[PDB]
Amino acid sequence: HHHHHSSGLVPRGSHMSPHRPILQAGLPANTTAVVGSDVELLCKVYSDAQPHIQWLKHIVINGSSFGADGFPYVQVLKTADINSSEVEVLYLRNVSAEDAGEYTCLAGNSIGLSYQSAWLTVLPE
Amino acid sequence: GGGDRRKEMDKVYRTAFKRITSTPDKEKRKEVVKEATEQLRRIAKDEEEKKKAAYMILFLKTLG
Secondary structure, eight states, rough: OOOOOSSSOOTTSSOOOOOEEEEEETTOOOOOEEETOOOOEEEOEOOOSSEEEEEEEEEOOOOBBBBBOOOOEEEEEEEEESSSSOEEEEEOOOOOGGGGEEEEEEEESSSOOOEEEEEEEEEOO | OOOHHHHOOOHHHHHHHHTTTOOOOOOOOOHHHHHHHHHHHHHHHSSSHHHHHHHHHHHHTOOO
16 A cells, blocks of 8 residues: 555645645535625635636526536636635625526646536525 | 647647736737637537536636
């Protein structure tokens, strides 16, 4: 087997190669909200190399989140140059029916780009 | 097929990501994005790679 001092991520500047960012499973999570309330989506990004954060919202046109060609309608909400030592947050204040749909968190470094998604459901009051 | 496609798409990302984060000249960044866009749409065949191509272009386009 393999015996090392740490089973965590490879330290920055080590003989081990760096990897693409790792997004923790379950974040963002599918949340449900009532109109007018505030919603916060999380995204825990692990990375040795510097990653850039990006939040998108999937846009629906004619009942479809994809174009006639097949590329997704997405809207850039937030970007960041470095990941946090805590967590990444997307603040959705005073949510309405139009805020519902698919939200995607993205983190990419010198190696790759990783992305996870979640669905926000908005119910009436 | 699909495996060789995603490997080719990763090479385009790393090559583009290295240039955007290196020079701050917005004109040179737009040229690498344009170049990365043309190669990425040619490799993409199914919906998983098309969404992945769209995601990477916007990631590099909005890179600080």
